[PDB]
RNA sequence: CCCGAACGGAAACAUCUUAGUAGGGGGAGGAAAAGAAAUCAAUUGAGAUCCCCUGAGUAGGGGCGACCGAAAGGGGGACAGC
RNA sequence: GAGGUAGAGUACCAUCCCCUGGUUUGGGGGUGGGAAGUUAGGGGACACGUGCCUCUAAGGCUAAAUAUGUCCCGAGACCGAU
RNA sequence: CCUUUCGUCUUGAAACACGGGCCGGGGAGUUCACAUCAGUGGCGAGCUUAAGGAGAUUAUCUCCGAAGGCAUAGGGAAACCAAGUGCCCGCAGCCUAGUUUCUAGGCGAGGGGCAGGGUCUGUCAGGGCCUGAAGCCACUGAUGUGAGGCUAGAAACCGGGCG
RNA sequence: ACCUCGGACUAGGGGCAAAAGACCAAUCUAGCCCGGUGAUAGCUAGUUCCCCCCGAAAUGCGUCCUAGCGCAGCCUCCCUAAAGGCAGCUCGCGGGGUAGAGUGACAGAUCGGGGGCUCCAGGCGCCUGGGGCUUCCGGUCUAACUCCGAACCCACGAGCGCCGAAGAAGGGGGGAGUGGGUCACUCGGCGUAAGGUUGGGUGGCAAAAGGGGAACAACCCAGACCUGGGUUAAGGCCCCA
RNA sequence: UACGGGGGCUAAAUCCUGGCCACUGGUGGUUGGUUAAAUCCGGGUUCAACCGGGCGAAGCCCCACCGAAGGCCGGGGGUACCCUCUUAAGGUAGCCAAAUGCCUUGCCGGGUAAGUUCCGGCGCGCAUGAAUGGAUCAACGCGGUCCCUACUGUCC
RNA sequence: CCGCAGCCUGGCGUUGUCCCUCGGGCGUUUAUGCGUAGAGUAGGUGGGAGGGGUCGAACCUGUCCUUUCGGGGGCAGGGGACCCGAAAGUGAAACACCACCCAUGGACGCUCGAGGGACUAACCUCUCGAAAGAGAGGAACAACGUCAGGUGGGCGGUUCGGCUGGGGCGGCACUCCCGCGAAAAGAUAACACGGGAGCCCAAAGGUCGGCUCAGGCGGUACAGAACGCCGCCGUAGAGCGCAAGGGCAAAAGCCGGCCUGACGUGACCCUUCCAAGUACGGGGUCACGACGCGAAAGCGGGGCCUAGCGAACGCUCGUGCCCCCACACGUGGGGGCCGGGCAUGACAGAAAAGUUACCCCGGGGAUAACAGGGUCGUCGCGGGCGAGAGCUCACAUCGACCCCGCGGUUUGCUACAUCGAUGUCGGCUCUUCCCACCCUGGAGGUGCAGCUGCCUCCAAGGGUAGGGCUGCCCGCCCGUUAAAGGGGAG
RNA sequence: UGCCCACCCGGUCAUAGUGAGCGGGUAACACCCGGACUCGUUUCGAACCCGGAAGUUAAGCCGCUCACGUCAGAGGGGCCGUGGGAUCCGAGAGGGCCCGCAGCCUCUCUGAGCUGGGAUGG
RNA sequence: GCCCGGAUCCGGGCACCA
């Protein structure tokens, strides 16, 4: 599905409708020193079995496509709810 | 004082718990061990160790699941120091 | 008033393992590195800096308050020959 | 004249379903801890002592010991902030009149409905929790949970020894 | 590679095996003794005195769940509260697409005739046969058809009827059991059927004696506090009786 | 102390032991890719934790060899012969209705008055075949089976 | 599914002395440079038209090194002194000099490594020695300790889903949507029937305007049933992303214009889930803030309506602040509240393969095999009808296509009884019964001359044997016989 | 006056509809005449929009007749269901009786526009 | 998510606890 690069929606910081630049969401690096990564490493020291459950059965084939909209006057960003699609063709 | 499980529970089970238990080896005494702050807590206070009632299933640990778990302080018993 | 003394493979650091409520913070052990030493060291829940507060590790000894019951005395809404 | 063999699982079973020769004796919901309800008792914006100390006719008894706990303020992750009053119905009961006989009329504690007040969140209406002054202790019983846990019953797994 | 005796060595996740999982003190797909240990059991068996009052469920959803549990429904006990409640009927006002009935009202199926048009084949422009379209007339059907449409069932208001200040709408609290059902009548789905299997409604049994059906959980009569007298129901009246 | 110690498979002798290295496994090699801790460099942090980069062993990816290593030994089209695909090749010598053949009491012969068993031959071999050992019986058997003679209370 | 030994390899330690080489760096040292247009080697940024010139130049003649032998770079003498342009070309010019960069090689002092070689005194092996000690060989490797990667059923712990006309194999009736089952309110089951979803669309979404669809008829060149034009009819016979059902005509369809309401925050209600508890998901109605389209009322938090989706913990992003300790303040770093994404299809969410005929325990008649019960499709037998054949003639005899029944001797279907046991094939031995009659007895018909046949009715008193083959039962076969019937009794 | 007849805005949404033929207007409703201007045709003043007024009852509109459509009433014909009951019938499928309720189709005949709010005509 | 090679995709070896 095709989506424009620029969309005019409500900027809640500016309190009016402004232009936004559209991009797809992408996550960051896992960042060792996160509290749940410090705890996992503390659990893997010593002897034992595999410590934690790991997923093996997979059913879905797509992923929810999320749109990221940045207000072009104040850089305020609104993140929208995702929707299961193949690959959002963001070309204008 | 060292070495050190499984059954069982988690309605399965492996981290976990059971449990530093059961058991094994070494060393005493009429009691042992600990014991005179490189301690606690907080506007500059207390004052060696041990035991009882509490603080308290609190802080906190945990497939943050089942479950596990203090200390300071308060009240007492005895209350030495070299 | 001036000068002298104060415990080393020890404290601590990285890593591995076991304990622990100890969690980026606690304890012990194995392996490697390894101080300062009074113009010094340690501590005050991640790490460091500056004040402030507090203590002196790495050498021993130490009654009383308590744990037990082979044994001796006494007691009892204990049993009464399956 | 009327009447199939007891207990049991089970739709029924129930008997060609299982346990059952006779008699005597033994033989299975118990204890503790916490929590919550109930029946009663004591004190009441408070209640209650624990460990313990002193005395004594010495495991009883008497005096002392509120440390702590529960309740009295709640909301919020936290920094932080912090109530308890005014309207309407109206049961019992009381008063007035008739007691003809009584929602006829007033007043109405407890109870119900609308609001108000504290706090978090939202940009207002909103949404969550709280606030209209009763609890603590004791004895007994019931149930839940934890310990063997109504009584009996596995195949197994582990530690140390003996052949 | 013969048979046999005395001594000795190998020990339990270990030994020894000319190999069968054989043998290791009547024990071996992992010996025995004592301890952990009264291991755990959603499973099986047993669970001890009398009277009185009330009185179920075998259903829905979730669950490594269907031999078990949680949340609801149904039983019992207590406190409160203070005037209405609804298991039944009638009237009024509304909802519905089932039995039936239709097919020229949609969608599918389905049997014959008459007229008109066309092509092909045969016979001597005509006749006969087959095919396609149109038109008119009659006939057969539908769980997944409807231009229609009952009996019947249901919502609300009023009235009647019954319960209620003695036995009490709404609120609060304590304790459960139950989650294997089964048959008869009746309306169905699957099946050649079945004392089959799976649904809706009513009733027994379960948890219900007694009277009838020869005897009979379930069918018909009927709900047993005890003792005596009477009248009936179902059923019966030749003998058993 | 290799005419040895250790480890496999087959099973005396006689006649023999075919084709295939694609897969798995073993052994060896390497232009090259990836590759942990430690160390080194840059950033960051008054120090650390933390981010990057470089270097990076064995193994793996890649190549070759090995069938008395585990093993495997088909189909289609055309005229015994040639081409193609699975996945490398396409059952050689022999043997058979086998202690291995579903159909099945296969078909023909022998033996019996009469033979689903037995013997011989055949070979549409569901699903025979070569040390996973093929064919083969001299001697031996408290091994399995069929036939004859003798003998009999096994039977009438 | 995982662990742990053993093995292989690397770092650190025990671990030491002499070298040599190579690769990095640090402060230095230097000399080397042709996409094309052109006096010709523009590699680039600038000061810089002046720079060199007894403050010794352009020029002939050779030794020599090199290169895409293009051509430039350095040699002293013969020359006692000359050339580039400010002028001609280049998306970028001056061999006018000087600087840095890209880029070649070598050398100084220092550091880091990496590799190779040698040595002996650690360490190891052997010999002699009662020991003390001595000798020989190897050697900083091996070996051992510790950490890291690989391999690793050698050994240990475990898991090996469910429903289900027994279990298994199959299927998915295991999450969701439409019709029917379903009995005109609501609720309602089947391994019942007919099918679908796990997405697609920046327009296929919002609004405003204009228009009318499938199909048919008349007239027109190519023109044809079906191109464009002019007229007539047309209740929908079209289209509306996708299953099925419902809805829709100055539209919800077709064609255009302008847009992004497929919007930020916060509530309530319906359905999933009847009355009567209940997570997600989906939908509906709004408040505040801001937009779009319309003259306007207004319509618009996606698609005409009913499917297209997912907990805790963990990670991550968005968004404004709150907190960090036995004291206070500061920096880095962590944690918190509110919303989005990463997924569990067994879809109200575990991280998971077989095998046992060597097997074991607790149970189950809630559930299979033998046997009993119910049913009779299958199996065996009877009746009706009469196509036909029998020279003619349906019924002496046979009897198609269909229709109505019986038995309980086959095989199925069901799961009522037995799972703390009712000994499960065949044969032998012995007893009895049924009749649907094979022989023996009676009667009749005939396509009955006699003999022999064929058929119908009564009748169960008596009989129904011996062998070969196979475990059989059935069956085939041999020689006879009056005939060598067929069934039941757990 | 009047009442009803058109017109504007409606309610009911076929008893109200569709086709054909005919009747009727000096006002009203229309066709009609024309385009400078507001506006306009992916060409066309056809349509929309603006400005007008000679002509006409031929269209539309209203009324009447006739054909079919539709809603009812009456009559002839085809088909037929159901709530409660019984030791009613029958081997069953089904059927009869008692108390309580109906329905659908097809022919033939007869009718068929009502109505609320406001400015022109009779 | 990486490296690397090959035409955003593909291949090889390693990273990856809802």
Pairwise CA distance, residues A80 & A7, whole Å: 13
A14, A72 contact by CB (below 8 A):
no
Question: Which value in Å is the resolution of this experimental model?
Answer: 2.7
- Nucleotide minimizing C1' to CA distance for residue A43: B15
Q: Strands A67-71 and A83-85, how do they pair?
A: unpaired
According to the entry, how was the structure determined?
Answer: cryo-EM
Provide the Cα torsion A8, A10, A16, A22; round to 10°: -40
Nearest of A64, A92, A91, A70 to residue A20 by alpha carbon? A70
Torsion sign across C-alpha atoms A30, A36, A42, A43: negative
- Nucleotide minimizing C1' to CA distance for residue A36: G314
A1, A88 contact by CB (below 8 A):
yes
The answer to whether some atom of strand B lies closer than 7 Å to the beta carbon of A39 is: yes
DSSP A11: E
């Amino acid at each position: 599905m095709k989506v424009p690069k620029v969309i005019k929606t409500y900027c809640p910081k500016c309190k009016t409708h402004t232009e936004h630049s559209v991009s797809l969401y992408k996550g960051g690096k896992r960042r060792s020193l996160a509290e749940g990564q410090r705890r996992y490493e503390r659990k893997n020291v010593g002897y034992g079995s595999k410590r934690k459950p790991e997923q093996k059965r997979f059913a879905k084939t797509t992923k929810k496509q999320t749109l990221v909209l940045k207000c072009q006057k104040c850089s305020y960003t609104i993140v929208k709810e995702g929707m299961r699609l193949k690959k959002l063709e963001l070309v204008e």
